[PDB]
Amino acid sequence: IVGGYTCGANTVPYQVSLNSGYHFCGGSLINSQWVVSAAHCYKSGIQVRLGEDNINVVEGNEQFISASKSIVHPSYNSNTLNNDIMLIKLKSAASLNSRVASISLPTSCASAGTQCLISGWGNTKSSGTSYPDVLKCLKAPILSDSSCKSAYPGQITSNMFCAGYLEGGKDSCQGDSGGPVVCSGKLQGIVSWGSGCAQKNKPGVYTKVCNYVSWIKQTIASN
Numbered sequence: 001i002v003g004g005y006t007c008g009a010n011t012v013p014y015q016v017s018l019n020s021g022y023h024f025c026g027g028s029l030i031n032s033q034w035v036v037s038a039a040h041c042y043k044s045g046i047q048v049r050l051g052e053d054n055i056n057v058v059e060g061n062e063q064f065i066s067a068s069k070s071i072v073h074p075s076y077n078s079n080t081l082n083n084d085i086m087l088i089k090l091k092s093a094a095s096l097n098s099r100v101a102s103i104s105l106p107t108s109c110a111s112a113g114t115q116c117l118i119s120g121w122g123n124t125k126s127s128g129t130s131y132p133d134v135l136k137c138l139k140a141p142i143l144s145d146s147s148c149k150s151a152y153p154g155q156i157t158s159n160m161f162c163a164g165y166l167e168g169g170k171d172s173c174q175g176d177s178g179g180p181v182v183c184s185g186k187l188q189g190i191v192s193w194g195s196g197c198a199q200k201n202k203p204g205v206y207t208k209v210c211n212y213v214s215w216i217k218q219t220i221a222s223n
């Protein structure tokens with residue numbers, strides 16, 4: 001996250017870190033046994049880390065649970081990033097409490113202008129690299145479809161939205177991939193892609209979760 005603030009330990013209780021020997025992507029806990037992330041995060045041998053703040057120090061509220069199955073969306077296109085969503089099933093159910101909690105799926109899509117919270121352990125610099133060990137947060141609005149398409153001609157599908165600031169300076173960045181965009185207490189987005197981070201006229205692009213609720217619910221019910 002570039003231009004954000006330190007969230008505070010366990011203030012984003014649905015945020016997860018995906019770990020394959022190191023943090024490599026975020027995700028969101030949507031019930032006691034399932035995590036949603038980006039399809040571009042896919043790999044084998046994922047351990048899901050819940051209740052994290054400092055990802056390099058055991059602070060006492062963590063739960064570490066191996067993934068038993070990953071399901072990339074059937075229409076994910078790695079070249080265009082269309083349908084950039086994946087589900088991960090945990091080998092055992094997480095113990096839910098005030099610091100580890102699921103986030104609700106949306107019943108409707110959020111409109112442009114809605115303020116959302118984006119969070120992650122990604123790079124905090126737009127040039128150069130500095131990775132934080134504690135979770136960073138950013139409040140940002142959903143941008144209109146027309147501004148999003150004007151910023152990324154030819155590249156925005158109906159399964160994507162832009163959020164952030166056309167002036168630059170505040171954005172998600174490398175290592176935030178797969179993490180949550182939460183608006184009005186519902187998961188509306190997944191950190192997906194962008195052109196660099198925090199550049200003028202290049203806001204972050206997010207998977208539009210409301211288009212996937214039926215797929216998520218049917219997949220969870222059968223797996």
Ligand SMILES: COc1ccc2[nH]cc(CCN)c2c1
Pocket residue numbers: 171172173174175176177191192193194195196197203204205
């Ligand atoms: C350094 O630029 C990158 C590189 C990879 C990335 N993945 C996801 C994002 C979010 C950008 N809003 C991103 C940014």
Ligand SMILES: [Ca+2]
Pocket residue numbers: 052053054055056057058059062
């Ligand atoms: Ca920790």
